């Protein structure tokens, strides 16, 4: 139910690529709480920097309604 708003930059370290390729390297997008964990690992394992993270939807205290 909580959504992370994350901005990241993933450079290309092989084959350079040719067509316009702009949303594939620097992006900002909402990510769910449950999948943000395994995606942050993927971003930093693909040699990508995580510029910004925002809590956005959720509440810091939580304790109920988070798991919905």
């Amino acid at each position: 139910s909580r959504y992370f708003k994350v901005t990241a930059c993933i450079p290309s370290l092989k084959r350079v690529r040719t067509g316009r390729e702009l949303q594939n390297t620097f992006f900002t997008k909402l990510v769910p709480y449950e999948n943000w964990f395994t995606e942050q690992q993927r971003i930093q394992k693909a040699g990508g920097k995580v510029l910004s993270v925002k809590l956005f939807t959720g509440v810091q205290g939580a304790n109920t309604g988070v798991g919905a």
Binding site: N63, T64, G65, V66, G67, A68
Partner: protein
Amino acid sequence: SVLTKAIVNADAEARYLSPGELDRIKSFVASGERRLRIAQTLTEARERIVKQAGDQLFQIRPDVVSPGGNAYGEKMTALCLRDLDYYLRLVTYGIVAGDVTPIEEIGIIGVKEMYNSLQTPIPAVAEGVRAMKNVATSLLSGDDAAEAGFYFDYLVGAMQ
């Protein structure tokens, strides 16, 4: 709660509430008074329920209080009783809410890691919760006893 579950499903589907969900909401609001009476009864009888559950658990599993047991020691037993009180409180929360959402968000997700990191016997905790169910069912009428027993059975099933 039932309201939270129905709203979440309808919002995920992107539609207004269905007649079945409306009927279940009406049934929940009708049964709310009986639910709060049951919760008040259990809250009043929280101490006796905890004590009788503790004695039943210890008679069933004396090894847990044995030297090679996780619950060996006076404060080790006190902490187990405190966790028992916690789960009884969660049972009252679920009974008042009409579903198991707060219980899930508080005390079943990550509880396998809970007791694996603490080396605590999950089957022993389940037996203690069952003793709690017996004690609480001894203090309610048949319909309310079954209603609380559903939530106690849910806790036992989650502890599995």
